[PDB]
């Protein structure tokens, strides 16, 4: 099925010189790809967006999706807090920068344009227990200084 | 206050959820240890236990310190 590609670069919703994917109607500016693709050196063959690459990689199998995300979380056990979020970045296409809506409505003198113009009118356990004990010692010392201060001011 | 260990809801309908935050979780007394029942690892329990111990030590220290400052205030009051 030969679907028509969108005349707007889906990353910046603007029209211009863009390369299109053969498996999704999304087209993207050469400056919007990750990494930005040089219009002089084009990727030879069938080029796909990040979403299509990830999809064909996972072969539409949700079990593989969960397996790979679980492995990715298991490997990122130093930044585990972000792990899940990380697995989402390399799967989805990029977009330009737009602040959230609640930031748009903070001040009344600023208004938004349709073009995007905005106008005004292990070792680690040892280290961590060490930090614990050193801060504890520091603050109990500060408490001792509190007591010394109170005693010196009240004795006089 | 009462139990912390639930029933064993088998028929293979139990939710094992390995959390993405392991050092300040609370989650149950329904732990399962690995190298809604929530899985956990030894180092997480190590850190929770030492966290409890040090927080409690600082709490006791601050209690003794409040006692001593109230005492010295009432002492100089005399």
């Amino acid at each position: 099925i030969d679907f028509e590609n969108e005349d707007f670069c889906s990353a910046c919703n603007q029209s211009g010189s863009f390369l299109c994917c053969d498996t999704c109607p999304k087209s993207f500016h050469f400056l919007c790809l990750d990494p930005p693709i040089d219009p002089n050196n084009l990727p030879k063959g069938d080029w796909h967006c990040n979403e299509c690459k990830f999809k064909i990689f996972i072969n539409n199998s949700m079990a593989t999706l969960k397996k790979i995300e679980s492995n990715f979380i298991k490997q990122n056990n130093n930044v585990k807090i972000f792990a899940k979020l990380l697995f989402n970045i390399d799967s989805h296409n990029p977009k330009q920068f737009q602040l959230p809506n609640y930031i748009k409505e903070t001040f009344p003198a600023v208004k938004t344009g349709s073009r995007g113009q905005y106008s005004d009118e292990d070792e680690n356990s040892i280290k961590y227990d060490f930090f614990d004990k050193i801060y504890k010692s520091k603050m109990v010392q500060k408490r001792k200084l509190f007591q010394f201060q109170e005693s010196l001011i009240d004795k006089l | 206050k009462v139990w912390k260990k639930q029933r064993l809801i088998n028929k293979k309908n139990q939710l094992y959820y390995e959390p993405l935050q392991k050092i300040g979780y609370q989650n149950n007394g329904n732990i399962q240890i690995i190298p809604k029942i929530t899985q956990i690892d030894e180092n997480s329990i190590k850190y929770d236990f030492f966290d409890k111990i040090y927080k409690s030590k600082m709490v006791q220290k601050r209690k003794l310190f409040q006692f001593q400052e109230s005492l010295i205030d009432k002492l100089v009051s005399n």
Binding site: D122, S125, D129 | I31, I33, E42, I45, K46
Partner: peptide, 30 residues
Amino acid sequence: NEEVTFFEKAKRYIGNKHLYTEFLKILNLY
């Protein structure tokens, strides 16, 4: 630092795996 060594000592002393699992569950319930 030395508390890591305490946990290693406990794992050594208990010896068996299941009893160490029970020990860790005691610790977490605490």
